[PDB]
Amino acid sequence: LTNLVAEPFAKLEQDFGGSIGVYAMDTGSGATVSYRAEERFPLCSSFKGFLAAAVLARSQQQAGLLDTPIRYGKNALVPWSPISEKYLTTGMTVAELSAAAVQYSDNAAANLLLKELGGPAGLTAFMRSIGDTTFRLDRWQLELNSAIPGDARDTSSPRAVTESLQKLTLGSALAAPQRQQFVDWLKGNTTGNHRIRAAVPADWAVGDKTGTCGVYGTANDYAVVWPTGRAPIVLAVYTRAPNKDDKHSEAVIAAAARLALEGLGVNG
């Protein structure tokens, strides 16, 4: 059921000048599309989706975690903190920080939440707890986006990303209220309109989380997609390229998503 229909991913990544990794799962039939799916790619900001899921998992054991107000100093505001910068003088709840990390990729919010979970090893531990043996977060923010060729720090694979995303959004890794909250945050993402969403018809529901490291042509998106009248699709698209100055491409991510949907026989 893997790659029943071949798609021209090699030509796409060659035109891009780098490597594209794709894993897509039809959760109804179990059919998959897989291209470089077990290779490691930098997570970049895409770790923040799993971070929010880890917070939700903790909230199952800590009632009122999500409503806890968190105050922070100006030293917490790092570049690209578009939401948390507007609440510096007031604080934000854990739930608000989680929403900002997912939907705006807010860096200060993600750092505050990572600290709460016990740092990179704490998030990695959460992923191990759902059965993901590939994911690793190693560094704190900014540093973790170095995207160095061959460096396994702060990486996962498209396959493990998709498998974990399925468990968290559709499976049993979260309790049902927390699962729907995670789905709702992903559905409200604002940063992915030119990536997987650009391949998804407007009348289908979709949630996603993006990442862009800013070097080595490295960017990504993962998503759950609900085509009407059939089971949902879970997919991940990650890119990298050999040279530090190589640029990422949103168009290549959308094109790879289109090829994945075509490979699954999803009319869209």
CA dist 224 and 27 (Å) reads 10
- Other CB atoms within a 10 A radius of the CB of residue 64 amount to 8
Answer yes or no: 163 catalytic. no
146 in a known ligand binding site: no
The string over 116-147, giving b where at least 16 C-beta atoms fall within 10 Å of a residue's C-beta and e elsewhere, is bbeebebbbebbeebebebbbbeeebeebbbb
Q: What is the arrangement of strands in the sheet containing 219-226, beginning at the earlier edge strand?
A: 32-35, 19-26, 233-240, 219-226, 205-212
- The answer to the question of residue 250 being in a domain is yes
Tokens for 43, please give them. 């997570």
Residue range of the domain that includes 205 = 9-264
Do 248 and 212 contact (CB within 8 A), yes or no? yes
- The answer to the question of residue 1 being in a domain is no
CA dist 92 and 110 (Å) reads 12
CA dist 2 and 159 (Å) reads 12
Handedness of CA 108, 112, 113, 119 (dihedral sign): positive
**Of 237, 231, 230, which is closest to residue 254 (Cα–Cα)?**
237
45 in a known ligand binding site: yes
C-alpha dist (Å) from residue 253 to 22, 199, 205, 221: 9, 9, 19, 8
Please report the resolution in angstroms: 1.2
Tokens for 15, please give them. 């035109």
Torsion of CA 152, 155, 160, 161, to 10 degrees: -170
- The answer to the question of residue 3 being in a domain is no
- Active-site residue identified among 38, 129, 143, 172: 143
- The answer to the question of residue 115 being in a domain is yes
CA dist 218 and 16 (Å) reads 11
> Tokens 């806890």 correspond to what residue?
68
Tokens for 47, please give them. 């770790």
- The answer to the question of residue 2 being in a domain is no
Tokens for 209, please give them. 């989380």
- The answer to the question of residue 94 being in a domain is yes
- The answer to the question of residue 68 being in a domain is yes
105 in a known ligand binding site: yes
The partner residues of 9 in beta bridges, in order of sequence, read none
- Other CB atoms within a 10 A radius of the CB of residue 10 amount to 12
Q: What total number of domains does the chain contain?
A: 1
Answer yes or no: 19 catalytic. no
> Tokens 């971070």 correspond to what residue?
51
At 218, is the secondary structure helix, strand, or coil?
A: coil
- Active-site residue identified among 7, 13, 34, 45: 45
* Way it was determined: X-ray
- Rg (C-alpha) for the chain, rounded Å, is 17
212 in a known ligand binding site: yes
What residues contact residue 182 under an 8 Å CB cut-off, 6+ apart? 52, 53, 56, 168, 169, 174
Backbone angles phi, psi at 167, to 5 degrees: -60, -35
> For the domain that residue 78 is a member of, what is the CATH number?
3.40.710.10
Do 97 and 111 contact (CB within 8 A), yes or no? no
The string over 215-247, giving b where at least 16 C-beta atoms fall within 10 Å of a residue's C-beta and e elsewhere, is bbbbbbbbbbbbbeeeebbbbbbbbbbeeeebe
